[PDB]
Design a protein around this ligand. Structure first.
Ligand SMILES: COc1cc(O)c2c(c1C(=O)NCc1cccc3ccccc13)OC1=CC(O)=C(C(C)=O)C(=O)[C@]12C
Lengths: 11, 264
């Protein structure tokens, strides 16, 4: 889960 | 060293200004009338809404309550992105285990959404669309169940919270403290988060001591507000669980689904 948050967190 | 604490406070304030376009300062300037630019368009009923739906919206078949709810969803998504960018500016955050960063945001963003919504609210309504719209509290509260009861709790908190009279400098640190909560469920490495938060809490205490000399109770009240926000968001999530279950026309935005998923 959290595919979107992951990429937001990594510039 | 208080010097480092003030430098930290200023760093957070500066990052806050970079990450969040509509500040409480700019919002209060609009709510009152400091600016001379076109005041926001006021939406207070079904009639005012349909004509303002072009000055606030930068389909048209779904009922009003649904349309307004979807709007709240889109703003919250934008806000999650703003908050994520702010979080990444907090010293130490990006060096945390990436999974813990996700966990901190998953449990934190909505508490921050409630907090920052207050900046755009007064007793009578909320600024929307980067300040170009103003939707009244009474109109939102009047939206058919369950949607009216979804809007109102945000105003109830904002009224209480705004009584504290924080400014953007206070808020920058308050928000940072909330994000760096070492007791969120499922965190892997607690100590490094607690250490960052301990320093942020000292920064907040000193900020309130200097910025609100005449209100010694403020720091303790803000700590309780952090506690209140957890219960407040739990209720938000639940009410939203009921909505996605009871309304057949509920396209829950993917980012929100991702955040709400397994939120217990
Ligand atoms: C009443 O609020 C709103 C109504 C509304 O019509 C809209 C709002 C908000 C908005 O920004 N509100 C933020 C918000 C988020 C979550 C819970 C809330 C509870 C009460 C008040 C505002 C709340 O922001 C919007 C974002 C969009 O992309 C829209 C569209 C369709 O493009 C909207 O339709 C807007 C212009």
């Amino acid at each position: 889960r959290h595919k979107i948050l992951h990429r937001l967190l990594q510039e | 060293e208080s010097a480092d604490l003030r430098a930290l406070a200023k760093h957070l304030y500066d990052s806050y200004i970079k990450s969040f376009p509509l500040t409480k300062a700019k919002a209060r300037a609009i709510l009152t009338g400091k600016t001379t630019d076109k005041s926001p368009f006021v939406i207070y009923d079904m009639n005012s809404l349909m004509m303002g739906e072009d000055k606030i919206k930068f389909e048209q078949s779904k009922e009003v309550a649904i349309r307004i709810f979807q709007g709240c969803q889109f703003r919250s998504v934008e806000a999650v992105q703003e908050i994520t960018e702010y979080a990444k500016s907090i010293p130490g955050f990006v060096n945390l285990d990436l999974n813990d960063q996700v966990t901190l945001l998953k449990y934190g963003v909505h508490e921050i959404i409630y907090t920052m919504l207050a900046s755009l609210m007064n007793k009578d309504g909320v600024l929307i669309s980067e300040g170009q719209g103003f939707m009244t509290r009474e109109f939102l509260k009047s939206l058919r169940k369950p949607f009216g009861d979804f809007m109102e709790p945000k105003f109830e908190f904002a009224v209480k919270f705004n009584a504290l009279e924080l400014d953007d400098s206070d808020l920058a640190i308050f928000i940072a403290v909330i994000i760096l909560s070492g007791d969120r469920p499922g965190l892997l490495n607690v100590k490094p988060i607690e250490d960052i938060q301990d320093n942020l809490l000292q920064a907040l205490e000193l900020q309130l001591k200097l910025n609100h000399p005449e209100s010694s109770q403020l720091f303790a009240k803000l700590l309780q507000k952090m506690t209140d926000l957890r219960q407040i968001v739990t209720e938000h999530v639940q009410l939203l669980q009921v909505i996605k279950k009871t309304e057949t026309d509920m396209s829950l935005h993917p980012l929100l689904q991702e955040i709400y998923k397994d939120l217990y």
